[PDB]
Amino acid sequence: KVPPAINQFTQALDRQTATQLLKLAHKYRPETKQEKKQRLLARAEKKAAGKGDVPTKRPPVLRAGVNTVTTLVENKKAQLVVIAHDVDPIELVVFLPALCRKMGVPYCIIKGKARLGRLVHRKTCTTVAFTQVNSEDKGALAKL
């Protein structure tokens, strides 16, 4: 018998619901390699044109690492949290759903750490979170 805080990790999402979640994310993934470099170089060249530098607005994007996700959850700046269900030491995110329950932050248990990895250039990411999204997609967010 697994304990309650472990058995919570087995009622993962419905596949098609996860598919809407991911298709939503793929318009939001952060900047990967060979994109970072080109955007930054073009921005360096926009410096001489006074239209863009490193400091300028970035539209809302993902927040991957566990430390960052937990920080913004406990500051209640999260509107959606995803959680990979198969994490090597389960104690990494055994507490997390309880935190989301404490602060009313929506959270979901998806299958696979590999998918969250594909959501960046990295190989795996324990969690991701939408803090805010583009208004035009706010409703599509809110339904899910």
Added chain:
Amino acid sequence: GAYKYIQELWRKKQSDVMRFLLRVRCWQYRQLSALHRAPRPTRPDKARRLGYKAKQGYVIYRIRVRRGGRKRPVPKGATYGKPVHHGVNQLKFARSLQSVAEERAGRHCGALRVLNSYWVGEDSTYKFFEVILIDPFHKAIRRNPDTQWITKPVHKHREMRGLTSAGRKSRGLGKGHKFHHTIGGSRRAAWRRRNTLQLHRYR
């Protein structure tokens, strides 16, 4: 901070994850070696807290040790000598099981230098430690001035000499009125200078 939650969790006990994932080692140290590399520090809490960074060049070896007293090795267990130096049942070794494990892993893997270790499980007749090890000849480590002290050869194999937090305790080393066995730097130095005569050139 996530690591605060992890810390508090490991501080607490009476959850079965230990029982689940201790067998995951007791079986595999008997399927594969009793001393084998792990690919990730199972407690990224404790590894980092001891001093660790997943930068390239860092290893952990998880190792089993067998626990108990230490029966004095003599033929048929009857030791010749005056009868206070008998006794082979209840003897107790003079270093922490953690330290024994540390030195076992270190002596097994040359070219890797110890940094510390920590506990991951204890079944009934065992102890499941793991050791953080540095590769002192990888450029990704040697080009980092914060931690290159491991490069220089004064620390060649720290663990047998006993400089690491695992075996330093057994040195009886400390500060105060509770350590006058070692007020010279070592249990042997604080002796060898206190039981020398002292003959000046003028008496």
Added chain:
Amino acid sequence: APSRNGMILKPHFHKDWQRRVATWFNQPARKIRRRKARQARARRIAPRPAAGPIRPIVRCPTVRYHTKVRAGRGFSLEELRVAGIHKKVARTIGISVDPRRRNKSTESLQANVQRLKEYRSKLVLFPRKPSAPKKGDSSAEELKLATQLTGPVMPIRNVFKKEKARVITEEEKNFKAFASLRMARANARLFGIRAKRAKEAAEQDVEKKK
């Protein structure tokens, strides 16, 4: 196997004590070595003071020596703060610092730091360049002169009061000293038990006021 005395001594380990020191024939050679090393480093850092940092005046521990002062470890942090010197700068301008030292009478700074700065401007912090644009100040006292030597250890031991001839006043004589000492000594030792039995008396002295 005695005849008059009864005194016993240490040097006997039946496995020898010979195997420990006899060599003190170093002593003159060691003196030469350490003296030569001091010559060397005092030459290498020429203008900086011989014995290095200033040390602060402190009053020693237990009753046996609580009347004389001496050079402690270093200046403390709150006394430096009231002196208005940053901790990271004091050492560069050659002042000793040991934060572990709590202070309960900042008797040091009043003279020590102001006098030290006065001497430092008698012979100034040399500017970091021969031209002194705000990476060195008040070089006027190397423009005047320097010490082609240093000042050896700064003075620490000179203080006793003056003790004048005052005529005796009457109440001093009428004061009784041995009685004072004995009775005030017995007071503090009896202090607690008096409190206990005062409480004891008050218990019935108020239950009979109920």
Added chain:
Amino acid sequence: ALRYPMAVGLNKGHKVTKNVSKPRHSRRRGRLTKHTKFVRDMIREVCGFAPYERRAMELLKVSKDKRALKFIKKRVGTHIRAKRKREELSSVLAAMRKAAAK
């Protein structure tokens, strides 16, 4: 009679003005914080209690405190810790009953 400086017992000044000081920053370590207490009080309910805590809670349920204390002492060791720990076992049992009758 005419007052003269002699220090009775333990003093921290009988002749010198107590020159002021501010508390050092190493003595501050130990007190909680609004965030750390929060972390403690959430992980506590996430995990649960140890068997020795639960047994003492049941013995406080039957309310024989002079046996609950002995149970906590014989397991943790120091009467200081047992005294300070029975208080935390209460004020949690109290919360349980108070929020059940609610």
Added chain:
RNA sequence: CGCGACCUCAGAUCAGACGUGGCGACCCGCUGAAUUUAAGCAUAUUAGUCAGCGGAGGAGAAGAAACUAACCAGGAUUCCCUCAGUAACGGCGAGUGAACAGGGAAGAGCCCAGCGCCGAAUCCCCGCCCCGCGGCGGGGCGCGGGACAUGUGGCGUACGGAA
């Protein structure tokens, strides 16, 4: 079934690196007895010593206090004088035995994790182009490959810090 990830886990005369072995005067971690002494003898003493094992360096271990103190307070480590054959231990017999204060030699301070903020801002490898090149580095072209969201770099560590 098939494809593709992550995870675990394998072989390779794969690419580049590294360790063993000696000496042992001094140093460090273990093990560690008996002659002998008490006129006998086992507790003690010889002794945490010789023998045994492992591990280094030009010195090693120590080291910035979970310290001393009880004072009008000192303030990391080591070494010398001294405290002192003293406080204590002991078939309280033989014998064993420190420290703190004081005067000196020398003198020095510091760094992570954690909590935080900064667009992973970090690092390694490989191809090549320029200086150098018997301690393999400096710049640069790499729309080269990889580690790292299970935490790299900048700030900062109890002497408070940050905004």
Added chain:
RNA sequence: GGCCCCCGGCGCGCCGGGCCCGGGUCUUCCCGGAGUCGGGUUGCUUGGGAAUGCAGCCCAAAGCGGGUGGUAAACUCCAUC
């Protein structure tokens, strides 16, 4: 004291890399190291003695907390890290 060779030497002149960073006052926010300390028990060791240090096994935490204040214990102040 003289001559001739190779390796240092600290300043200078010169090129080039990268480094823009401090101090005060006021308001606000943050602040720590677990099967570890600690308790018990058995051995060893120590001048440490109702147990100095170290281990093995059993127990096993709290954070105005923890450790120490040389006789075990409860209460209560105070000092010290």
